[PDB]
């Protein structure tokens, strides 16, 4: 009952109950019904616990024939992983990368380069899909004149996914225009 | 010496010294050399103080003939405002908007619409420049195979601004392609 997977699941469950600020090892201990120094045998502190959480979320969702398809699905599965739990995005911030994740980075780069992306452009492209996705979820995860009214009605009805996808599409097409030779 | 501007300047200075997590009214009090309940007359708590900080940063930098120029400069001056202080980005998160800021939102929308953006696309465009910029600065503000090596050397030399601008440019051009009639 403090097998790794149970600690993690319990922590994730806690995150949804209390969010990132609320979550503390003391409470984790209490949830699991063990004494804090027992938990502490398994889990140094809060940073260590966030790190595993970030990784685990990514492992359930980061499960992803052209580069425009890879980019897009990539962004999507990342978005889903951050959405998966309360404050997922804040959680993911300032996580230190794993051995596999650098492997993957190398792969993605080898692939995009082998589609006649310069390495520079390879990086710029990942980077920017990266930032934009994170940017979106952070904001999605927070808390009288006419255009603003229509804009409430508008977003009331659609939520964040249609905008998010749009952006992403604009992004990748901006990249496509990059890809063609001069200017 | 606890005129509003001095409280704010002192707080900003503190933020750079200690960052967002470190900053506390207790320390603010101590810096200014006043007793905490005196400070407290002026400043309810930390959230209230963050809010003014966010606003003030924006007022120094958010000082911004086509829509591609407005979009781009807009993103830039926002980026600069978040960069202006340690953890600026984290600060800006979850700030509640001012009276002027809704005015401005209305304006920007009236403008873009009057360039034959549908309102939907107006929103999607601001939104996405918005997210992408925030996304970038958050990450800029944190803390063995060949392509990764070149990629270190690469980013060693350039820092975050060249990538950031690239993305932005891709973005706006993706939007341009949107703007043309069907498909």
């Amino acid at each position: 009952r403090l097998d790794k997977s149970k600690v993690i699941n319990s922590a994730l469950e806690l995150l949804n109950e209390v969010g990132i600020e609320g979550l503390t090892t003391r409470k984790l201990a209490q949830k699991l019904g063990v004494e804090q120094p027992t938990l502490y045998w398994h889990v140094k502190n809060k940073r260590a616990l966030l790190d595993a959480l970030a990784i685990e979320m990514l492992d359930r969702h980061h499960t992803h024939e052209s580069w425009q398809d890879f980019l897009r699905n990539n962004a999507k599965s990342f978005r889903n992983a951050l959405l998966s739990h309360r404050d997922g995005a804040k959680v993911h911030l300032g996580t230190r990368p794993t051995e596999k994740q650098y492997e993957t980075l190398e792969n993605q780069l080898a692939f995009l380069t082998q589609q006649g992306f310069s390495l520079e452009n390879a990086l710029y492209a990942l980077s920017a899909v990266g930032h934009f996705t994170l940017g979106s979820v952070l904001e999605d995860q927070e808390h009288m004149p006419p255009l603003l009214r229509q804009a409430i009605e508008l977003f009331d009805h659609q939520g964040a996914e249609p905008a998010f996808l749009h952006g992403l599409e604009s992004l990748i097409r901006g990249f496509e225009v990059q890809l063609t030779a001069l200017l | 010496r606890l005129d509003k501007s001095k409280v704010i300047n002192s707080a900003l200075e503190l933020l750079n010294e200690v960052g967002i997590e470190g900053l506390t009214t207790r320390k603010l009090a101590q810096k200014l050399g006043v007793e905490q309940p005196t400070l407290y007359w002026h400043v309810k708590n930390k959230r209230a103080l963050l809010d003014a900080l966010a606003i003030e940063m924006l007022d120094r930098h958010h000082t911004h003939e086509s829509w591609q120029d407005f979009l781009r400069n807009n993103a830039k001056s926002f980026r600069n405002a978040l960069l202006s202080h340690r953890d600026g980005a984290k600060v800006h998160l979850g700030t509640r908007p001012t009276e002027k800021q809704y005015e401005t939102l209305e304006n920007q929308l009236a403008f873009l619409t009057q360039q034959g953006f549908s309102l939907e696309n107006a929103l999607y465009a601001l939104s996405a420049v918005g997210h992408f910029t925030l996304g970038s600065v958050l990450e800029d503000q944190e803390h063995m195979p060949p392509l990764l090596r070149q990629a270190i050397e690469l980013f060693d030399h350039q820092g975050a601004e060249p990538a950031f601008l690239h993305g932005l440019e891709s973005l706006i051009r993706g939007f341009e392609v949107q703007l043309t009639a069907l498909l």
């Binding site: 993911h92 996580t95 993957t104 | 944190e142 990764l148 270190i152 050397e153 060693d156 820092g159 975050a160």
Partner: peptide, 13 residues
């Protein structure tokens, strides 16, 4: 150096 930049990229992989 630009080390953290690459860390940041790997971190979302």
């Amino acid at each position: 150096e630009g080390l953290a930049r690459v860390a940041a990229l790997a971190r979302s992989r």
